[PDB]
Design a protein around this ligand. Structure first.
Ligand SMILES: NC(=O)C[C@H](N)C(=O)O
Ligand SMILES: NC(=O)C[C@H](N)C(=O)O
Ligand SMILES: NC(=O)C[C@H](N)C(=O)O
Ligand SMILES: NC(=O)C[C@H](N)C(=O)O
Ligand SMILES: [Mg+2]
Ligand SMILES: [Mg+2]
Lengths: 316, 331, 316, 331
């Protein structure tokens, strides 16, 4: 009569980076036995700054295969790219049981280390039946956050993770969650992305805009035949002239182009300064560049047509 | 008896959505840098209550196309014309305002106020924000208390320092905030209560002298993410870039491929600054990267585009990584 | 084939305060004709700092009676207590057609006045069929906010209104709304509060906590036989000792007592420092003191039992 | 040769959740001011690396029960013991920390650092925040650069000035922020980069001298909302209160009943300060209230509880509304 919860470990400073094994992490929080029967599996043990497509595909297939063997999943992970992995799993996971990602800003051995209570709260969330069907979740700093909107907002603050556009789903207090929101964007088993038989993802890179931006990064991606390029635009997804010329070319030359923004909140919109339809570009909406990459890679497993890509960007 | 005299304020116009226009008041489509400075001034009839305004159109572009030559033209003009006026307002686009503001913060030697201003809605839109913003920027440039605070950005009733200020939202009129150390002052009824001033050295306290420069050192920016390509970094290194700024993940970390390329580059004398794609907080020393070992510099609270500004200026004085680190600790 | 939209005007600086009539407000935004057929009715013309129970009851009955005559409602109102009126209507309105509140930080005649585009955007929201069944809404600064969580965060900023705990429902760009959230708390026709035949509300006052707080405010409410007292507590709804003693007494003497917090975000929780069950107190959750008053007044039309009041505070 | 010497730092303990305890590491129930200062110090073994720490238990309460007499005891103690130590940390509850911090900001004359610190989780909870907060507060009190910045609050790796600092969330360890003008500095690896200092007069630049005072003037706070009762205001007026602070709606506005009672009061010599229940921004002059006419004072960015602090101190010098307004413009 306690839930069966699986911890899939990937590394991160919660395990510091990526040094301590999943068994040690579990054993260091003996109160986990008050709330669940926890089984731990080591996927990788890396800093999430070196996170990659192979790990993503591994996690998605593992969760999908092992869904009916457990009541919920907790994924221990680095902070740096937690928001990218959360969103990838948000779109590719077909288990509608809770999938909860957790990290830590401080290691196990630092004063006032945040990882133990973080993990406790992540298991609370994975064990709550109300957590189901809300898509892939990130639990940090007593807060339950959806995988699409969650992002890291500060380089060192324990309270870094926030859903900056649409806000959190619930707060955790005394091992209980008052959920007041759920993501409306289609997730998990409401998406067509199916990664079960894929061993690589389409090649998508990210270029930065700023004053006097060089076009050389964008050119190097075009020259390598990248499947897609996300622009981290200025303001409402705008492009420096040199970058705009190279991306205009890419989009008529077999590279899907998504305009996102370096600006940390708000949508990159259509109908502003850029005629997306004319250039064949897709506007990313509230997806930031790293998140837009995620969805563009997945869109590219279904289609190369920019009109169909924009439609994906409007639904997921 | 004495007579009140209004300060002389010069508007240097560069374009931006503040000078943007579209064919409907109620649709979001517009084109930028289309309206001249005279039109802007005459849309704020009340400016005569507070200053004698003169405008000059320096260029008329979207700030998405801001570039080194416009930066050099502005700094030189302000430094040359200092004695001719009581203060400057610069009308500018939002997109790269935080870059131009910091460049000018480090290169203007005039110690009269320099205030930048823009708008999130075009001049043609319903409830356009540009008119009162411009009025507020003139208030600020005319205020004796505004002097010696460095170059300023005024937007949404708030006076922000050019170092910390950044745009936080793609569309919101409240977008501009000093996200680490906060604003200098708030404006109500044409009056400012200043409660802060930036401690970092600016303006006539920096060594950066652009008066004779006709170009700036080449500095590129590369982004980090999961499975990040090393191709952008390599392209910058193949082109002989003087510097590269890394938009790192978390506290300025790098994907291993990117790290490898930049370490190699730094050993051949490319300056490499670690910054962060994360929108607030410092990229610190003494975290996961041994900067001393690789010859890297940590950007502190400077975001990637701002670190590029200081790196380009740093490279005009020195190519030594320890001396560049000290610059990033002082300015 | 454009929606029929009714503007119910109450005053505020949008009409500055409370001086200009609803007809003038409408006529000043001739682009409203592009999106709706707008009919205006004047309810009152007051600064919302003088908002009161009679106006609330008027609005609720007017909307409920006139529901089937129109496609949506826009309510022009002052900023100062917009969050209280929004929440009252959120709980008492039985029309599930859009009800949208709007104000302005600057008058009609000030430079860059915010009221015209505010009103335009509020009519856009009231005319969108997707706006229906999300409860009573506040539209300010291109943002659609639920009436329960919305509050004013700054004394003068045009961007003051924010849903500080759970975030907005959607952003408005180019006359279109991308809704990604809806309130989970029960609203409008999912609440039992029925105000149709009520001409007054239970008497509920608010006392402030701080260092060395006087108990005299709380005593004056008890001495007048108030139906309820909301505490604006310190931190997690805590009470200064003198105030705590007087409120302990009130709760065993015929006055319902709700602990809220002066702190602008986060829940006033049970199971912290205060034994609510023992003192007969109710914890307000994320409802701030003025919002907790709203719900406590309505709870008092159904019940005086603190256990039943806490249950109301956990559902609405 | 020379030897490193560690600064002498005094911990004045007052209680708070930092000294709180509960029977489980994982339940939220706790009771406050239960654990003595010695226990706190010994839970941070690394404090010896940075200071010679001495603790004194001044009182042991929840800050929800903070009061004038504790404020007087603290200020007098700090001012008396200044020469005996290199800096002070005050362990304190969160709930009213922003009030005590501003009181001390206006009454300490010691110009060695005074740093307040607390915790959002009790000392017994999993991942308790108190230990590193205390470590960080000692870092800050030991840092020469911390002097002459006024009284400070250190929480969540951030150094905040006692005037602007407030608690923003009921439970979050990140709750403390300077919501109008931002923090002074951030702490990483035991080091602070200070980029701001408060312009408002504090400490030895104020006239407020509490050395001989054994009480403070009586100042109450009343809240405004729709249909607000005048009974609280009247109760304060019936008790002969020296001052009343209004927690107004929006920009410090009052419900008409409340307005009537306070106007009447002010005409009989009660000091009335308009503040706001809204969590950020100034209560300004020159808005909907004619303050001159009624003899009211506008609080600026001071929230109601902070305005009470300055009003009580103001009332020790003057009962004149124009002179009280000038105090609220300067401190
Ligand atoms: N706090 C952390 O987890 C940062 C670490 N670099 C990681 O992302 O793996
Ligand atoms: N709001 C704006 O000004 C955006 C415009 N693209 C600019 O930066 O010039
Ligand atoms: N901006 C405003 O609407 C404030 C005005 N006092 C009101 O609430 O009616
Ligand atoms: N977090 C805390 O310290 C709350 C406690 N009631 C106090 O203020 O003493
Ligand atoms: Mg004359
Ligand atoms: Mg010796």
């Amino acid at each position: 009569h306690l839930p069966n919860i699986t911890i899939l470990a990937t590394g991160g400073t919660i395990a510091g980076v990526g040094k301590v094994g999943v068994e040690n992490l579990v054993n260091a929080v003996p109160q986990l036995k008050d709330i669940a029967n926890v089984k731990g599996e080591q996927v990788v043990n890396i800093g999430s700054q070196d996170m990659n497509d192979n790990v993503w595909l591994t996690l998605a297939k593992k969760i999908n295969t092992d869904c009916d063997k457990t009541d919920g999943f907790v994924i221990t992970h680095g902070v740096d790219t937690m928001e990218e992995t959360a969103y990838f799993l948000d779109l590719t996971v077909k288990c509608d049981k809770p999938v909860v990602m957790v990290g830590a800003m401080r290691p196990s051995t630092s004063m006032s280390a945040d990882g133990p209570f973080n993990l406790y709260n992540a298991v609370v969330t994975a064990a709550d039946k109300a957590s189901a069907n809300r898509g892939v979740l990130v639990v940090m700093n007593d807060t339950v956050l959806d995988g699409r909107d969650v992002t890291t907002t500060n380089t060192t603050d324990v309270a870094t993770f926030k859903s900056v556009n649409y806000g959190p789903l619930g707060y955790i207090h005394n091992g209980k969650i008052d959920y007041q929101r759920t993501p409306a964007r289609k997730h998990t088993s409401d998406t067509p992305f199916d990664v079960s038989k894929l061993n690589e993802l389409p090649k998508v890179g990210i270029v930065y805009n700023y004053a006097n931006a060089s076009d050389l990064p964008a050119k190097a991606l075009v020259d390598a035949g990248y499947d897609g390029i996300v622009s981290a635009g200025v303001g409402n997804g705008n492009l420096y002239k040199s970058v705009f010329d190279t991306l205009a070319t890419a989009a008529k030359t077999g590279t899907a182009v998504v305009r996102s923004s370096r600006v940390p909140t708000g949508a990159t919109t259509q109908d502003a300064e850029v005629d997306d339809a004319k250039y064949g570009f897709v506007a990313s909406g509230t997806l930031n560049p790293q998140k837009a990459r995620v969805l563009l890679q997945l869109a590219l497993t279904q289609t190369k047509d920019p009109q169909q890509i924009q439609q994906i960007f409007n639904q997921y």
